[PDB]
């Protein structure tokens, strides 16, 4: 029958979970041969001026940075970006896995390994006129249910020898100098899709967020691969933010976002500089190269002590709060690992700097005495210089292997970055009483971008829901 009351259906936006390719938006000049510019020209969408955000009201959503697929998607883009951008002079990657040749093609003699001897023995030559078709070999660490080593026939263009098989696959290709300048990259959801952005000043990357907005695109992010220190990332709106899925678990890393950035300045590679020196007036010996100085491999990373010291103090206080007040907070150098793990490795200009973070991570904060000592040392000093080295052969972060690149031509510039976060790994374990020890960590590049995408969630939009008056 209806009533005098008029019911108006409210076009309430409805949001549903979806995963799709995020379209990278960036402002870059096609003419430039720069790595990021050429990539943008190859595949990007223009960044819209003043996009703004649409704020959703009375909407609360549970966010999970770790679960957020966008991170994986971006990481894949990062991997592709680097692989095309930088071509090694020599690429080393293992080919074949745990394959050991015990018999060579065209052998009629069965050869067998003997464990007790530690040597190969001629098991027996075949009476019948049969010659081995393919390379016969055993697979290390592979045991059948029968308790037998798995044996895999190998067909190669060239016959491998007994006791061999499994090469380093040397790949040799051009490695010309290519300019690498990180350019912020926005990510925009495809039409019919939106990005939900948590607007909380302090959010740990997980849990319900009441303050949520719809954004077409993410904020611009520089694809910087860095170990130990998060470079040129987002700065905390409020106090230092420490994020971990499980603080209690020592294996889980702690990602620390800083309220203020810390300046890290390294120097070395740049464009070639041309100089001519006549020498000896010319006749008798003319125009060459003199003044070779030291080793270009050497570099210095300058970080202001006071700025770093305050940063450490803030982080330590936050850590102690999170864990609870009672355990000590200690910053210690890495236990070890590959150079990339051991030192703050990061790429500038297409070359990786390995900077020794030991000086950065050598402090105890539990006692006033320590605090006084640090203060006094700071007062005497000004900046901390970290020894940095550029290794032309670099361990590949994407996959297990080695990549080789050309040495720097000249110097004269400064490679600068903002330490916007710290990656901390806690030793933990039963025995570590009265103390908690944090060491710089890395190798899982995803983490670098997880911190960036923690607040971003990609959502599908379907036809608007209609809400009757109730």
């Amino acid at each position, epitope marked *: 029958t209806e009533k005098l009351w008029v019911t108006v259906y409210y076009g309430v936006p409805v949001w549903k979970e979806a995963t799709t390719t995020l379209f990278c938006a960036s402002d870059a000049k096609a003419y430039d041969t720069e790595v990021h510019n050429v990539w943008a020209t190859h595949a990007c969408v223009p960044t819209d001026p003043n996009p703004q955000e649409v704020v959703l009201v009375n909407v609360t959503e549970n966010f999970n940075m770790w679960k957020n697929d966008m991170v994986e998607q971006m990481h894949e883009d990062i991997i592709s970006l680097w692989d095309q951008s930088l071509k090694p002079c020599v690429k080393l990657t293992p080919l074949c896995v745990s394959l050991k040749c015990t018999d060579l093609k065209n052998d009629t003699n069965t050869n067998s390994s003997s464990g007790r001897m530690i040597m190969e023995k001629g098991e027996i030559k075949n009476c019948s006129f049969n010659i081995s078709t393919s390379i016969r070999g055993k697979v290390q660490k592979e045991y059948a249910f029968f308790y037998k080593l798995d044996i895999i026939p190998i067909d190669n263009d060239t016959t491998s020898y007994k006791l061999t098989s499994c090469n380093t696959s040397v790949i040799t290709q051009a490695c010309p100098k290519v300019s690498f300048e990180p350019i912020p990259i926005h990510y925009c959801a495809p039409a019919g899709f939106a990005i939900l952005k948590c607007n909380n000043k302090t959010f740990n990357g997980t849990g319900p967020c009441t303050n949520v907005s719809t954004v077409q695109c993410t904020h611009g992010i520089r694809p910087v691969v860095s170990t130990q220190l998060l470079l040129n990332g987002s700065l905390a709106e409020e106090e230092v933010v420490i994020r971990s899925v499980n603080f209690t678990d020592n294996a889980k890393t702690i990602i620390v976002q800083l309220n203020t950035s810390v300046e890290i300045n390294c120097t070395r590679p740049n464009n070639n500089t041309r100089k001519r020196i006549r*020498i000896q007036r010319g*006749p008798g010996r*003319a125009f*060459v*190269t*003199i003044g070779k100085i030291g080793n270009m491999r050497q570099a210095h990373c300058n970080i202001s002590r006071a700025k770093w010291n305050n940063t450490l103090k803030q982080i330590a206080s936050k850590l102690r709060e999170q864990f609870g007040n009672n355990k000590t907070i200690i910053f210690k150098q890495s236990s070890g690992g590959d150079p990339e793990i051991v030192t703050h490795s990061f790429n500038c200009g297409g070359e990786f700097f390995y900077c020794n973070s030991t000086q950065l991570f050598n402090s105890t904060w539990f006692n006033s005495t320590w605090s006084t000592e640090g203060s006094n040392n700071t007062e005497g000093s000004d900046t901390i210089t970290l020894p940095c*080295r550029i290794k032309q052969i670099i361990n590949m972060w994407q996959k297990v292997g080695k990549a080789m690149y050309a040495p720097p031509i000249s110097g004269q510039i400064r490679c600068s970055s903002n330490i916007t976060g710290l990656l901390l790994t806690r030793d933990g374990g039963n025995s570590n009483n009265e103390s908690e020890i944090f060491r710089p960590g890395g190798g899982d590049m995803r983490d670098n971008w997880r911190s960036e995408l923690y607040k971003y969630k990609v959502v599908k939009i379907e036809p608007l829901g209609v809400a009757p008056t109730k």
Partner: antibody, heavy 113, light 107 residues
Framework: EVQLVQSGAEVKKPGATVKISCKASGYTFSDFYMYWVRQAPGKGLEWMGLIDEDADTMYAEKFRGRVTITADTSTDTGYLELRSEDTAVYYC??????????WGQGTLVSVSS | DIQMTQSPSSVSASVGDRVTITCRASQDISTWLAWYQQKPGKAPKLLIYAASTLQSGVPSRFSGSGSGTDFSLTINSLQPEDFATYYC????????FGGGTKVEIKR
């Protein structure tokens, strides 16, 4: 002062392993580049390669990848690697003054049946 | 790689003769060259490092010159002790040697 000492003459059969070592003295081995050069009898000098502090090495096209040059900084020593077709005299060079100067006395490697 | 060629392969000369041996780089090496003298039974000796910089103990009569892809070493007055073999080396990155020039006594 600065002396480079190369290992004694080495005689090997074809395809046999020959490793020749040069030990540095009188300068900080780690801080300076070591160079390897081979000269065949009746033939000119052929530069094999150089080694840097970080173990990063350069090689000539002929020797590219096939030869690995390794240096033991702890003993201030360098090592080479070649074959019978390259049977010859091998020189280890160093550059303490950054002038591409000092050479070693040389090692004779004879590889024959 | 880069071809380093020096010529003539051998030069016949008398004592007191002025001898020019030319080293040519197939590609522009700019200023990165070195000159070495070698004698029978002897390791290479550095006459010139950086084709313009004199090594102490080298007589003035040795005269370097040239640039880019073309360099030449001129012996102003050739002497019995000078007679020998000569090599030109690229110094920019790959220390490649030239074919070699032998200066021998003309009779």
């Amino acid at each position: 002062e600065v002396q480079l000492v190369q290992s004694g003459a080495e005689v090997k059969k074809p395809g046999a392993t020959v490793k020749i070592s040069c030990k540095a003295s009188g300068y900080t081995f780690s801080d300076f580049y070591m160079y390897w050069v081979r000269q065949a009898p009746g033939k000119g000098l052929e530069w094999m390669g150089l080694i840097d502090e970080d173990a990063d090495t350069m090689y000539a096209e002929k020797f590219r990848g096939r030869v690995t040059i390794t240096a033991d900084t702890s003993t201030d020593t360098g090592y080479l690697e070649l074959r019978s077709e390259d049977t010859a005299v091998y020189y280890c060079a160093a550059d303490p003054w950054e002038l591409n100067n000092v050479w070693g006395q040389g090692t004779l490697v004879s590889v024959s049946s | 790689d880069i071809q380093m060629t020096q010529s003539p392969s051998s030069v016949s000369a008398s004592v007191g003769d002025r001898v020019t041996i030319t080293c040519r780089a197939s590609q522009d090496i700019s200023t990165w060259l070195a000159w070495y003298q070698q004698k029978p039974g002897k390791a290479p000796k550095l006459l010139i490092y950086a084709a313009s910089t004199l090594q102490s103990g080298v007589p003035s009569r040795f005269s370097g010159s040239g640039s880019g892809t073309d360099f030449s070493l001129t012996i102003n007055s050739l002497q019995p002790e000078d007679f020998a073999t000569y090599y030109c080396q690229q110094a920019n990155s790959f220390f490649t040697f030239g074919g070699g020039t032998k200066v021998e006594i003309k009779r």
